[PDB]
Amino acid sequence: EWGYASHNGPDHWHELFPNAKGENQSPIELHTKDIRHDPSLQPWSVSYDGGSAKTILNNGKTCRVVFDDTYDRSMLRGGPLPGPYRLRQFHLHWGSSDDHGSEHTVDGVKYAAELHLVHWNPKYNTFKEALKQRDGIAVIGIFLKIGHENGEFQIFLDALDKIKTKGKEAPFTKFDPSSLFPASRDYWTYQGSFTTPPCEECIVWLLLKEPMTVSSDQMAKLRSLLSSAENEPPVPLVSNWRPPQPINNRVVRASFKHHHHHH
Ligand SMILES: [Zn+2]
Numbered sequence: 548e549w550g551y552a553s554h555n556g557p558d559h560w561h562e563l564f565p566n567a568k569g570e571n572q573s574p575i576e577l578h579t580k581d582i583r584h585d586p587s588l589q590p591w592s593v594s595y596d597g598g599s600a601k602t603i604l605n606n607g608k609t610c611r612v613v614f615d616d617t618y619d620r621s622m623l624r625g626g627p628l629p630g631p632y633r634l635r636q637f638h639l640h641w642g643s644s645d646d647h648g649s650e651h652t653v654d655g656v657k658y659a660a661e662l663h664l665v666h667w668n669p670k671y672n673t674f675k676e677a678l679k680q681r682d683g684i685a686v687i688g689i690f691l692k693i694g695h696e697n698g699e700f701q702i703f704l705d706a707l708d709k710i711k712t713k714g715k716e717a718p719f720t721k722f723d724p725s726s727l728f729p730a731s732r733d734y735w736t737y738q739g740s741f742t743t744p745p746c747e748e749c750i751v752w753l754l755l756k757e758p759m760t761v762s763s764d765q766m767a768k769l770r771s772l773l774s775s776a777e778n779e780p781p782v783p784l785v786s787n788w789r790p791p792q793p794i795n796n797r798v799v800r801a802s803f804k805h806h807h808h809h810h
């Protein structure tokens with residue numbers, strides 16, 4: 548229905564999805580000088596079940612891994628969340644070249660890609676109902692910095708062979724996404740929305756400070772996917788990222804103390 552071309556891109560979504568025009572849209576630019584450290588922000592911790600991974604697919608917008616959220620198996624707790632959230636799926640956004648690709652930016656710096664781990668509050672009984680609440684969904688956002696090749700990320704990349712084209716899907720199991728987390732757990736949080744239509748404003752964002760490193764070759768593997776079906780001309784699935792939206796005056800807090808700015 549929508550896309551990332553010039554006729555159906557972000558600047559054209561609001562015409563079909565009113566929420567695109569909302570006041571709490573994501574992503575946003577992160578300027579450390581305008582972000583306050585909140586000492587009350589507690590740590591977040593996860594308990595994932597690698598056996599919970601179910602499918603990997605290509606919907607022509609990105610590549611997503613779907614997990615079994617029929618019950619509390621892979622949970623996210625702590626941080627600014629009121630209770631535990633179920634892991635439902637993770638997907639990526641990336642650019643055409645290594646110099647850009649992430650949706651959020653930290654002090655002007657863009658990364659090659661951004662990984663979004665999507666969770667939802669069971670208190671709301673159902674993902675659909677949860678989508679209606681401002682804190683219904685929680686998303687762990689991880690940046691991918693080019694550097695050392697990532698071993699665990701390779702497990703995921705290899706599977707891409709099975710879903711080169713749009714509309715494809717295949718089994719994917721025994722993969723624990725926490726294996727991709729950097730050593731640091733410091734994060735930034737604010738309330739926003741899904742970066743793709745309908746752009747619901749039901750997300751509590753947790754962006755980790757330390758990015759995950761991946762090799763240029765590995766990113767190359769990522770860009771090998773196609774945004775078009777099978778009996779169609781090869782169209783590379785690149786640039787599936789949304790530019791920053793207006794921060795307005797939303798509170799953006801940091802769980803860590805940044806020593807460089809004051810005494
Ligand atoms: Zn996303």
